[PDB]
Each structure stands twice: as C-alpha cells, then as structure tokens.
Amino acid sequence: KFNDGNLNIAYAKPTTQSSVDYNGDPNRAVDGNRNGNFNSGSVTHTRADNPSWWEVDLKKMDKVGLVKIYNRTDAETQRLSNFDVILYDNNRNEVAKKHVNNLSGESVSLDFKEKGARYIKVKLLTSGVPLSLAEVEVFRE
Ligand SMILES: CC(=O)N[C@H]1[C@@H](O[C@H]2[C@@H](O)[C@@H](CO)O[C@@H](O[C@H]3[C@H](O)[C@@H](O)[C@H](O)O[C@@H]3CO)[C@@H]2O[C@@H]2O[C@@H](C)[C@@H](O)[C@@H](O)[C@@H]2O)O[C@H](CO)[C@H](O)[C@@H]1O
Ligand SMILES: [Ca+2]
Structure with a gap:
C-alpha cells in the first residue's frame, strides 16, 4: 500500500466500472501494481460504453x-x-x-x-x- 512514502488509501478498496472486457476487472487499478502492460494482468478494461468510467469507493469519507x-x-x-x-x-x-x-x-x-x-x-x-x-x-496529502 505505499508510494513515495505516502499511504495509498485506494489500495485494495472496492472498485466498479462501466463494464468489463478482456477480463480487465476494476480491481486491477488498485492492486498495488503500476505495470501498464495490459497483457501482464494489472490493467483494467471496459467495453466501449456511453461513456466508459471507473470508480473507487474508499468505504468512508477521507x-x-x-x-x-x-x-x-x-x-x-x-x-x-x-x-x-x-x-x-x-x-x-x-x-x-x-x-x-x-x-x-x-x-x-x-x-x-x-x-x-x-x-x-x-x-x-x-x-x-x-x-x-x-x-x-x-x-491524503
Ligand atoms: C500498436 C500496438 O501496440 N497495438 C495495436 C494493435 O493491437 C492489437 C494487436 O496487438 C493484436 C495482435 O494479435 O492483439 C490485440 O489484442 C487482442 C488480445 O491480444 C486478445 O487476447 C483478445 O482476445 O483480443 C484482443 C483484440 O483483438 C491488440 O488490440 C489492442 O489491445 C486489446 C487488449 C484491446 O485494448 C484492443 O482494443 C486494442 O486495439 O492493433 C490494434 C488494431 O485495432 C491497434 O492498432 C493497436 O494500437
Ligand atoms: Ca494495477
């Protein structure tokens, strides 16, 4: 859960998105892995929506x-x-x-x-x- 010494409060929180394609589930954007190669498994992917979106829910205000x-x-x-x-x-x-x-x-x-x-x-x-x-x-900072 750490990045430049700062707590990433999005890590492992519930996520949703507009739809899923190529198994690019929304939780791939909060798995702590910044690797942007889609084929390596750490990148989300929606279908071609009207419009496409992705969201993280911190569960409480922060x-x-x-x-x-x-x-x-x-x-x-x-x-x-x-x-x-x-x-x-x-x-x-x-x-x-x-x-x-x-x-x-x-x-x-x-x-x-x-x-x-x-x-x-x-x-x-x-x-x-x-x-x-x-x-x-x-x-948070
Ligand atoms: C230039 C570059 O790096 N990419 C091009 C290119 O992308 C497609 C090719 O790499 C193609 C080679 O077979 O694979 C496509 O993804 C497929 C996945 O490999 C496969 O597992 C899945 O079942 O089906 C897809 C689609 O056929 C590449 O397509 C890109 O990535 C995928 C994951 C998706 O985001 C797709 O929309 C992308 O285009 O060729 C395309 C031709 O439309 C573009 O020119 C890319 O920029
Ligand atoms: Ca990731």
Whole structure:
C-alpha cells in the first residue's frame, strides 16, 4: 500500500466500472501494481460504453490530496484523454472535478488539496472508447 512514502488509501478498496472486457476487472487499478502492460494482468478494461468510467469507493469519507493515475502503456495510450476525475461524498454529491485533456508521459498527477470524499471516479467524455487504467493511487496529502 505505499508510494513515495505516502499511504495509498485506494489500495485494495472496492472498485466498479462501466463494464468489463478482456477480463480487465476494476480491481486491477488498485492492486498495488503500476505495470501498464495490459497483457501482464494489472490493467483494467471496459467495453466501449456511453461513456466508459471507473470508480473507487474508499468505504468512508477521507481527505483527498494527490490522485495519481497510471495509464496503459503497451498500446492505445491515447484512450486516456478528454476525461474527468471526480470526487463524490457519502451521498454521491459531486465535491470536486478536474478535467484532463491528455497525458504527456505514463501518468498524471492531480492535487485535490485536502477535499473530503468517499468516491473517486475517472470518466471518459468521449463515448465508444474503452477505459483502461494501470493503477489509480489516492493520498491524503
Ligand atoms: C500498436 C500496438 O501496440 N497495438 C495495436 C494493435 O493491437 C492489437 C494487436 O496487438 C493484436 C495482435 O494479435 O492483439 C490485440 O489484442 C487482442 C488480445 O491480444 C486478445 O487476447 C483478445 O482476445 O483480443 C484482443 C483484440 O483483438 C491488440 O488490440 C489492442 O489491445 C486489446 C487488449 C484491446 O485494448 C484492443 O482494443 C486494442 O486495439 O492493433 C490494434 C488494431 O485495432 C491497434 O492498432 C493497436 O494500437
Ligand atoms: Ca494495477
């Protein structure tokens, strides 16, 4: 459960996603493994939904600082583009949202500046595109 010395509170928490394809179950983004090669088994994959999304449930509200999202790396890297990262409280009210146009390397790091949330959702805004995430790490700082 550790990354840059900080506790990743998303590790091993319940996850869900819009659908599953190629056995790319949602729990692959919280298994502690950042390997972005889909074929090695640590990357999620939805079907081509309207739109595709993935979510982690921390089970209780917690403070969210950095969110670090590791992309698929073996192929189709541009799929993780034009997406929202969205925080929701215990009643699924939206508490914060950042939009990411694209990634320049293998990850993007967002800072939600200590906002209280239970759910972190990653949502593609382009429908008909599968969502694959190698890992989603969530920190209190
Ligand atoms: C350039 C690059 O690295 N990838 C191309 C390429 O991707 C497909 C090929 O690598 C192909 C070789 O047989 O395998 C495809 O995945 C298959 C899985 O290997 C197989 O287990 C599963 O049952 O079926 C899929 C689909 O045929 C590669 O497709 C990519 O990865 C899969 C997991 C999925 O995300 C798919 O949408 C991807 O395209 O060729 C495709 C042609 O459409 C693209 O040009 C990739 O960028
Ligand atoms: Ca993983």
